[PDB]
Amino acid sequence: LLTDLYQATMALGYWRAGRARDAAEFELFFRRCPFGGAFALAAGLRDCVRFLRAFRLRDADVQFLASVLPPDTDPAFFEHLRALDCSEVTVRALPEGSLAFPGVPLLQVSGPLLVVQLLETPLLCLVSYASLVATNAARLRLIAGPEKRLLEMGLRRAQGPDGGLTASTYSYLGGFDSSSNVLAGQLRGVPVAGTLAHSFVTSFSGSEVPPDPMLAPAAGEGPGVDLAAKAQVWLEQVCAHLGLGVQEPHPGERAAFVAYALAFPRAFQGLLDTYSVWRSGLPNFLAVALALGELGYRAVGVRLDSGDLLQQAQEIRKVFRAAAAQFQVPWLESVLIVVSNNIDEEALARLAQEGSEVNVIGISLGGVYKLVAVGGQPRMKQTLPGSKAAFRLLGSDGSPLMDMLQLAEEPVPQAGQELRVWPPGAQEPCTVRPAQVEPLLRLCLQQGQLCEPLPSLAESRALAQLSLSRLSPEHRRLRSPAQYQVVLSERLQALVNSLCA
Amino acid sequence: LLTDLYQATMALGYWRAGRARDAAEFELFFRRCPFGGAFALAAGLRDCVRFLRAFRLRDADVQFLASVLPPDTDPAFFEHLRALDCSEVTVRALPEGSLAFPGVPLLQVSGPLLVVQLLETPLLCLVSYASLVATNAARLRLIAGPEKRLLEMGLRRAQGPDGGLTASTYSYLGGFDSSSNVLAGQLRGVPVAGTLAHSFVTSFSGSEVPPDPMLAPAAGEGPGVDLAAKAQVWLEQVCAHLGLGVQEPHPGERAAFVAYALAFPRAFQGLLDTYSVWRSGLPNFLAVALALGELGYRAVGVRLDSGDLLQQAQEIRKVFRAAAAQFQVPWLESVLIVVSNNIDEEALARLAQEGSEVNVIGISLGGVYKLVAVGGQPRMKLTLPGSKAAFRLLGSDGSPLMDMLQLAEEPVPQAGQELRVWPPGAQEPCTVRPAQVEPLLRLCLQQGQLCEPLPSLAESRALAQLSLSRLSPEHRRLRSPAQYQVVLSERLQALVNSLC
């Protein structure tokens, strides 16, 4: 994944001109207030580093490039492209989970010019996307607010060949509790749920079959029950309890329920929606819930996709008040009510509220990779020169005030106070006295060898939840938040003025 | 507070000699490998800070003093004493749950000599005891290894007043799952659990009382049924099933269970071993857990203290298995099994696990506070001088290699490379390139006012568990672990030499 012609013409541009092995620093930051949010939260590195570690250039990829390029280029030092990197590259990176504000770096990348140049395209791919998914998952968690396991990704279908993965991965980071996706489960141990599908239900006519209809008893012992037969018997009792034709529940629906039940009898879930909740789905669920519970036992949830979810949520639990008084079955009412589809926001907020009988709810940044210094001399042209250190200044209450950029040479922190040139009011400086002064970009990789082990998602995820909880109300506002200062050291501001502002 | 004479004595000393407002810095650190491990958990920041208001005044303590006994005494200037405030005091701290190694400060306290000296005593107690509790719970969570409902404190004595509260809080931080302490529940939100008691069971004759023996059906309205009657009906069936006389399982026990279960129908649990487990506790549990249940309630729990617990537990599940089938009652299989009365930590290792059947298990530092500077002018005795900064060299499997020490003036290190003279260790410098370099002590209080909000015990507890995972295997070692090296800057070593 060198993938585009300009990468290679620029590569050979630099090779031909003596600059391929020149020391360059680059920085990836962004500009857009993302979703009209104040922050991104930061994600990508996971994938970044797996990539750098399969710089994959087959001799047949390269032979091809020589086809498209001038004959005889250079002495056929295409060799360079086969020697790649190995690595003289260096990365500092915001930890995933960290909050990220416009016009502060998230990566800084350092190395041979020709190489670190190649990475513009892939690093954006990864970071921009990862961060957008996380950041949104964060805003949904903000709307829902934090209670049980409420919040369920997915149900819905890939970008691409395989990358369902990443949606899943970084929604977890943002705050969702589990996921339908099994790639993310296997790799990264996202919790996996989400079992139900309309396409199962509608594949059944009615015409049930006994290759084996018999459900083993929950306990142990030979003969169980012809589970199908019994559920009919329970269906009489329910329709009686409900004022219904026994003729009325769709027997397709019943078969599929039964069919699910034989395979997952400890985890029997019920999709209420396919035809009619009230006159089909629900009666059939109970018929079948209650046939279990003698033998294979204790059903486990139901699902809705349409209508006023909140009104059906609330009516569904309702009269179990007497729909389990009537049959005496302790557990029915504490069955889970899962809802999905047409949710987005408010329903979202009120289904996360009130007294709501729902338990589980299914479901641009301006990213920029810029050279800031080559040959340890700075480089400028609205984006700031030279190789920088970055630092979040926090208030007494825990919450960030402002990020501060300064030179790599400079001394560092502390918890006494600073002059400091804000980039609006850039006529004279503040003095500011921060409670804490935590640095931002940590060393991920030096000379191609990792300088840190990689967090679990659960670490990364906890850091996010932490960072958001500590972030100011005014900066967490979904629309029209307060601004957030980035601001400059004196010696930076002076380099900016040196390099004719 | 100030609790012994010589504290007040030596205060008066400083006053009298014009030294009471002299700017001192002190270092609290520890000397000893506790339980013979290599590390401690830093703990007890929560209490030092609440406390620095509860110092509080009172004047009648100052009046008892003053029979300090020089009557005599300075223009009645005990007013300083009633004036005292722990402002001008500035602290830096390891955060909670960070590992700590002997050699390296846990706090620095700076301020007026007379003031910051007086706090030697409070801070020594609070920090020593909290860190000793957390470290112990770490050592035991290591030995239990890490599962889901498992590990449990543990109360028959800790202290008297505050010590229930702290022992529990800091066991939760070292990574117990929960506590029996209600006081810790209430303030610091520590899960609360553990419920039964031999004495409750021994209190029943088996002349049982029906003021109400009606349990309620758990479905929804309708009359409640007499639970004791039904336990009895069901007793005949369990003893048949088990091959015992209906007579052997003890009546008063059964009373006590039924009594519990009337109070706790959804969370019924069973102490098995008051009398016999096999001939009594267990039959009586099964009799109730079935009667209860025939009303739609589920049993939750059983408990052993005594016996060979690893074994009783596997035999028990056999029969829970045999009865869930026989009686058609499947929850009975995953009824939990709680054990208690080891405290000893070889026992723990048997019990956790093995494919052990148990679910839940019920259940000093060389500490120093030393003056390093007065009048920005260092002090050394012949322990380590000057105001310092401290730093932990890592990595790149994340595991620490050494803590390093440093003048407070010096630049901060990063992830190139470093010349540093050890302790043995004034022969010749090491050279080291840290992967990462964490600075350990962080400002939590400046000039009376706190410069950061307190982490939560979820936050502290996860950092502890975290920090322990990254530790190399040689420091995690319970018996005979490797000595963690602590080491000096050139400039710090250069100050130590003068005079030796």
Author numbering:
A (entry chain B): 16 to 378, 390 to 407, 415 to 534
B (entry chain A): 16 to 378, 390 to 408, 416 to 533
What does the paper say about this structure?
Nicotinic acid phosphoribosyltransferase (EC 2.4.2.11) (NaPRTase) is the rate-limiting enzyme in the three-step Preiss–Handler pathway for the biosynthesis of NAD. The enzyme catalyzes the conversion of nicotinic acid (Na) and 5-phosphoribosyl-1-pyrophosphate (PRPP) to nicotinic acid mononucleotide (NaMN) and pyrophosphate (PPi). Our structural data allow the assignment of human NaPRTase to the type II phosphoribosyltransferase subfamily and reveal that the enzyme consists of two domains and functions as a dimer with the active site located at the interface of the monomers.
Here, we report the crystal structure of human NaPRTase that was solved by molecular replacement at a resolution of 2.9 Å in its ligand-free form. The crystal asymmetric unit contains a dimer of hNaPRTase and a total of 98 solvent molecules. Human NaPRTase monomer folds into 17 α-helices, 24 β-strands and the connecting loops organized in two domains: a first domain characterized by an irregular α/β barrel and a second open-faced sandwich domain. The irregular α/β barrel domain (residues 160–378) contains a six-stranded α/β core (β6, β7, β11, β12, β13, and α6, α11, α12, α13, α14) that identifies hNaPRTase as a member of the type II Phosphoribosyltransferases (PRTases) subfamily. The crystal structure of hNaPRTase reveals the presence of an intimately associated dimer in the asymmetric unit with 3000 Å2 of the surface area buried at the dimer interface. The two monomers are arranged head to tail with the N-terminal domain in one monomer contacting the α/β barrel in the other monomer. As already reported in the previously characterized NaPRTases, the active site consists of a pocket located at the dimer interface. In particular, in hNaPRTase it is delimited by the loops connecting α-helix 6 with β-strand 6 and α-helix 8 with β-strand 8 of α/β barrel domain of monomer A and completed by residues of β-strand 11 and α-helix 1 from monomer B. In hNaPRTase the corresponding region (β13 and β14) revealed a different orientation determined by a 10 residues deletion that shorten the preceding alpha helix (α14). The resulting structural arrangement sterically prevents the binding of FK866 to hNaPRTase due to severe clashes between the inhibitor and the protein region defining the tunnel.
